[PDB]
Amino acid sequence: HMKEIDELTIKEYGVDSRILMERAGISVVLAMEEELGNLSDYRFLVLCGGGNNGGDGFVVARNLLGVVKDVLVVFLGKKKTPDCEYNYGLYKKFGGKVVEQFEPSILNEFDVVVDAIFGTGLRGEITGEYAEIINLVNKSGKVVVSVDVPSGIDSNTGKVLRTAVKADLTVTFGVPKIGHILFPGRDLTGKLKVANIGHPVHLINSINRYVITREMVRSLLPERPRDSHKGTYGKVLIIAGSRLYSGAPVLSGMGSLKVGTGLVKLAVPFPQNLIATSRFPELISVPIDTEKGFFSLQNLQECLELSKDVDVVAIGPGLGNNEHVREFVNEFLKTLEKPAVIDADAINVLDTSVLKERKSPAVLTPHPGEMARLVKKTVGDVKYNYELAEEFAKENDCVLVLKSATTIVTDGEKTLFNITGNTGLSKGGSGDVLTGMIAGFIAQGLSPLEASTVSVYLHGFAAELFEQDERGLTASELLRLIPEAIRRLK
Amino acid sequence: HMKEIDELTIKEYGVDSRILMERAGISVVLAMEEELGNLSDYRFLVLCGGGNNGGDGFVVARNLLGVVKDVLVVFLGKKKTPDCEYNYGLYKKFGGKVVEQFEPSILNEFDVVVDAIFGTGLRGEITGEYAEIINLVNKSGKVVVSVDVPSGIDSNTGKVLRTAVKADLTVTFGVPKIGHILFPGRDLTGKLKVANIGHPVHLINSINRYVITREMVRSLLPERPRDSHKGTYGKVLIIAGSRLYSGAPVLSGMGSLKVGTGLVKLAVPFPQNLIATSRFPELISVPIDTEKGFFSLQNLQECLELSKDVDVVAIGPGLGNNEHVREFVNEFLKTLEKPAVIDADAINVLDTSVLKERKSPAVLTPHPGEMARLVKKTVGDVKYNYELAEEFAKENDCVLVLKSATTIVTDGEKTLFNITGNTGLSKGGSGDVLTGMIAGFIAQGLSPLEASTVSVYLHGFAAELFEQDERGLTASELLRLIPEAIRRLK
């Protein structure tokens, strides 16, 4: 945590805590200027708690004195920490006004509310008068700037502790916190600026959880040497589809092709295999003869033979979920000595004992409902639960890609968060594309974790490049947008 | 001085000196980013003295660590003040490299030199190894950023103390110092940024010497009410010219007209008076009958009658300097009960006893040669000598406008510095225009000091609006440019 980074910076590096606090508060002023333009016509109401968050607020208020139209601090705490006390003293010595009672009508006389009530030191549900003030601020229609984290968000989880400030702009220090990255906190944060307030760069970099960035993805993209052939860019087998679900194979296959894979083969029950090549004749779509339209143990041997000539196998989209599919999937994965990308119905039938026995790598790509069924918990217990994702990945020796508006990618040691995308991906087919992308990057030589990092980012970013309203985005359009997302990274 | 502003801010307001020092150094980083763009490709050499200037330099260096290509500090002092010592310690704790010997070839390995050797604490001529280092830096062709003031400029006078750093960018704190404003220091400062580092606004405003700004001049410009007539905008008499110097009256008269004066009358020896109206027929140019082409006591009575119907009288441009002119000028000014603008040859013959006896106001507009003769000192002793200008103004109850590339305007209590203009004003005629402008603004209701402040600014700014090379600017073109300077203020 940053709490540890702050401590080391003070205690071992010797930076006075007052210096960190001064830099935090001025960062806020500068961030506000960048967003609002010239500050001199605005009236500011600064809401300060008794903690260091409030101390940062007193620095903000003091630095606006004499330079803006009006500043008032409402001090809502009981006691003040030493740095909040020093800053409160400075604010008054500089001629600043403080009141200790919040009058509902006070909001009327101000244009900008600076929320410095609670930061990362929030413990427990917000109730009582703190809650009424926060509710009044949220109904007020004023511009809200939150110091560090919107008051009421738990900065380790992104949960709302009964009530929380909804900010237009949040200015945080050193690094983004998990509560800015996961929802609902991500929503309540609004526009986030991360300010450098003087921590050693080595400490800021010792953080083990990361937001996936454009620069990270650009540096991970495989090379395309000019003297290459399709074998240079790998081969994917996708085991997918059924008489019920004939579209999934096509979306996965093209997902691998659009990210630059050399060769993609689908194994799909006949005659549903013919659907793929009618749409995209660049795909190889092998007919699998099945008894009743679903994979079963009768197809195990043919699928293992098909897998010998490829670099990676993706399995699960549209397979259906019955006992014969369960038998096939688990026996297949137990025997397959290739990296596996495991999605959708292959997750629903997965025996997790099988993952532990595999010598070869795997990536699992569940949404929360699938993760919930996989570990036998409720959706609410697994959703955005990055520590559970980490334990699972570590215990099962896999990469886990837990899908949601913020996607978590972890191998148990490193955890990345993806924030690209929009609600046009909340539609059948989206996931099938991502499965193909991941398999494809693995085929091109990226590690399972690297492949997953690059794929979640580009999948979300392609969605944002859709030119019309996001709710009309479909998987087919997403596929079209992938090479543009790639070009825009570079 | 800012030294006093710093002291009060620490001792009475309670701001830790370390906080001021941190804000100073970060201001420098941000100013450099604004000028250089992204800092991450540059290598920085930071030259730190043992004083607080050097301490600011250690803050700069520390804040570049891990974020730019390379940083090295050469520490050139002997001992360190407490804040320089604290900062030096921080720079090393953060992993920064310091060396204490300056190797001439070291300049080769860096792109930007940060000059934090001496600030406002400079005492005496720079010699020895400090001088060699400064001379090496000046020959190096690198980008030079000076902290507070370029090392070697006396911050109270703008003089070079034997040798001084020539900066591309100077970042100073709180307010500009006199040494940034007066030459040579103004030249060596290069581009100046003034950073707010947290002093109370009340202290920053208790400064009694000021740079004349666009906003100040805009707020001083007289109103032009729609229901007005020429009498609304005042009347000027200009007593000027001689058989030798027939152009000066014309330039002064039009200077009053271009700034918005309602009526302008010249009193000029016949037939030289006819020169004015041949060029600008809007002028009234009264013929004065003289014995030999110069004003004398024989014209005293006519000039006093002419002055009864005006608001202000300007006297001196092109009068010539002989005994009869001296008699006339001094007897005239002794008797004239109107504001007087006194320039050129009227200064050269002025008896300063006369100024003390006048009940009415005066403004004097000498260049340094004229000021030197007026107080019987050398040009070198009076040039940029704002304290002597102040004493003179105070002792003689006048406004003194001491002309030079930076013009000083003072009434003895308030002193303003003008920095608009260019070398196209270093040419016969320029001064005659300014005399007219000042008279004109007085006629329109500005105080002598206000009139002088507005006129020096607009005169310099008109010169900068000349569209071709400044060396070809002439007074006639300057006159043409005045209404454009006025429009651009608004």
Binding site: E34, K193, A195, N196 | L39, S40, N63, V67
Partner: peptide, 6 residues
């Protein structure tokens, strides 16, 4: 970029 990441 010295002060803020976006």
């Amino acid at each position: 970029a010295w002060l803020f990441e976006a």
